[PDB]
Design a protein around this nucleic acid. Structure first.
Ligand SMILES: [Mg+2]
Ligand SMILES: [Mg+2]
Ligand SMILES: [Mg+2]
Ligand SMILES: [Mg+2]
Ligand SMILES: [Mg+2]
Ligand SMILES: [Mg+2]
Lengths: 50, 120, 241
RNA sequence: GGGGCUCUCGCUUCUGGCGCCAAGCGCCCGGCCGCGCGCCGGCCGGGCGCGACCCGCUCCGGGGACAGUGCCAGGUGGGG
RNA sequence: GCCCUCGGCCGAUCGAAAGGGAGUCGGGUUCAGAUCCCCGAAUCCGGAGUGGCGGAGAUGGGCGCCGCGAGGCGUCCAGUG
């Protein structure tokens, strides 16, 4: 509410604890549910990657 | 070769906490229970409705201390009248006095208990 | 031999995004309490800043061998405790009633403690050796002592541990002690100590007085400079032929 | 053969799975039965290390003697 | 009692008789009270340490024997439906 951009709810794995982390990214246009996004230095150049 | 901090947070270590061992009691003696049995039960109710409770519902109606709860009323009636009671209903009157409807056990008759009390 | 085939290795992989990281040591990255961070940053500041020679002179202390010999000598003239003094007083009282009131045993030589006591001994030139702790809480209590001691010609050393000096004087901490007088049999031991002290503290006082401390950068900064100078060294290597 | 030498001093991208509380190895310490010759046979337990490299002085990064703050000086200031 | 290991609602506390929030209904009864009293049918939550009773788990196969058979005994192997 109050924001024109849709938000994306993305779930990662915590690398140090057995747990799931939920982020609230700003949705880039074209991304869909059930899609894999990759965040990091070695991430490839695709829509939605960070 | 075994001191390893596997967490990046420092927490306050748990130190010994001793129980109090006072060198003198702060009060010389424990003050006595003011809400004893004779304080709990003040006087029975002898009104028209109270009389109807005795004959019909096997219930003795009392005016009790406003601080006493149902457990204290139950034990107080049992001790100073030597009767068994089933349940205690309790309201507070508009004038501020607490009123207790003390139903007696089936083998106790509220009529002759009120007779030996002296409120018949 | 009788090895169970059911037994097998389960080698887990700690690559990025693979199996969860093990519980390894994280002391290097702990959020320490404020008092721990404060006393660690204080140590780093004493390395960053240019420490004046009056304060930096106390970072030069006696080595392990010489400090051990010095405290070995000082243990013999350790001051009497309360129970030792009370026993001596009781013995004097019982002796006096029987037939005494004299024989003060010359007040046998003892170690004089305290900065106020020691500085008056140095001014009167009645001190033969002065031992100063290197870690006085306000350094103002001692920064005048090395310069005063040489001005009066009294040999002075800096030892590590104000708690070590305190342990001699049966207290938690002593700022400085002094050998005023020594027994005849220990005169040779004191002379060997004093000569070793003079060559290291009194004789090179002009170097001590002009020796600034600190002014050392951190290992990360030093490494950045080192790889820059190494890169420029290769640049000059190609510059020449 | 292979060192000064450059990236690597890496282990995860076609799937809307799963993933922690160590396997393995080495070194020991208790108790049991016993070859009753000790590294000695086996059985119940407990511990440490490598697995998971070493060292170090700022947690990591970005600014930085500027910004900022305190005091004075000049300007502007119907916002009051 | 102490030691090892594990433990971020990461923030006290207050804030709704219309929000969220387990589980009570029928009949009778008073001058004035009743889903609260009486009668009769339920139901929720909590407790049960020495364990209240049942039922489940869980009670089957193989081999050696006795026994006309039925059925019994010994050994071994299973069995968190
Ligand atoms: Mg009530
Ligand atoms: Mg005006
Ligand atoms: Mg917390
Ligand atoms: Mg509240
Ligand atoms: Mg409500
Ligand atoms: Mg009404």
């Amino acid at each position: 509410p109050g924001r024109g951009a849709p938000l994306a709810k993305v779930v990662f794995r915590d690398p140090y604890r057995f747990k799931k982390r939920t982020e609230l990214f700003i949705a880039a246009e074209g991304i869909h549910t059930g899609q894999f996004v990759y965040c990091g230095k070695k991430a490839q150049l695709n829509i939605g990657n960070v | 070769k075994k001191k390893i901090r596997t967490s990046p947070t420092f927490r306050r270590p748990k130190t010994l906490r001793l129980r109090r061992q006072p060198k003198y009691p702060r009060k010389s003696a424990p003050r006595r229970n003011k809400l004893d049995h004779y304080a709990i039960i003040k006087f029975p109710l002898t009104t028209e409705s109270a009389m109807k409770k005795i004959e019909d519902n096997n219930t003795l109606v009392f005016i009790v201390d406003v601080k006493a709860n149902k457990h204290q009323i139950k034990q107080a009636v049992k001790k100073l009248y030597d009767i068994d009671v089933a349940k205690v209903n309790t309201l507070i009157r508009p004038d501020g006095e607490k009123k207790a409807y003390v139903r007696l056990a089936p083998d106790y008759d509220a009529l002759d208990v009120a007779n030996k009390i002296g409120i018949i | 031999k009788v090895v169970n085939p059911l037994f097998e290795k389960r080698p887990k992989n700690f690559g990025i995004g693979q199996d969860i990281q093990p519980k390894r040591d994280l002391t290097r990255f702990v959020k320490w309490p404020r008092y721990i961070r404060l006393q660690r940053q204080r140590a780093i500041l004493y390395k960053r800043l240019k420490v004046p020679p009056a304060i930096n002179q106390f970072t030069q202390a006696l080595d392990r061998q010489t400090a051990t010999q010095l405290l070995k000598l000082a243990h013999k003239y350790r001051p009497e405790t309360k129970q030792e003094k009370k026993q001596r007083l009781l013995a004097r009282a019982e002796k006096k009633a029987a037939g005494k009131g004299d024989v003060p045993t010359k007040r046998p030589p003892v170690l004089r403690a305290g900065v106020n006591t020691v500085t008056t001994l140095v001014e009167n030139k009645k001190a033969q050796l002065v031992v100063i702790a290197h870690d006085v809480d306000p350094i103002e209590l001692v920064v005048f002592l090395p310069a005063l001691c040489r001005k009066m010609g009294v040999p002075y050393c800096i030892i590590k541990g104000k708690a070590r000096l305190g342990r001699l004087v049966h207290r938690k901490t002593c700022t400085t002690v002094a050998f005023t007088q020594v027994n005849s049999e220990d005169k040779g031991a004191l002379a060997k100590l004093v000569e070793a002290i003079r060559t290291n503290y009194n004789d090179r006082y002009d170097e001590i007085r002009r020796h600034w401390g600190g002014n050392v950068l951190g290992p990360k900064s030093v490494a950045r400079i080192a790889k820059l100078e190494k890169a420029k060294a290769k640049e000059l290597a190609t510059k020449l032929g």
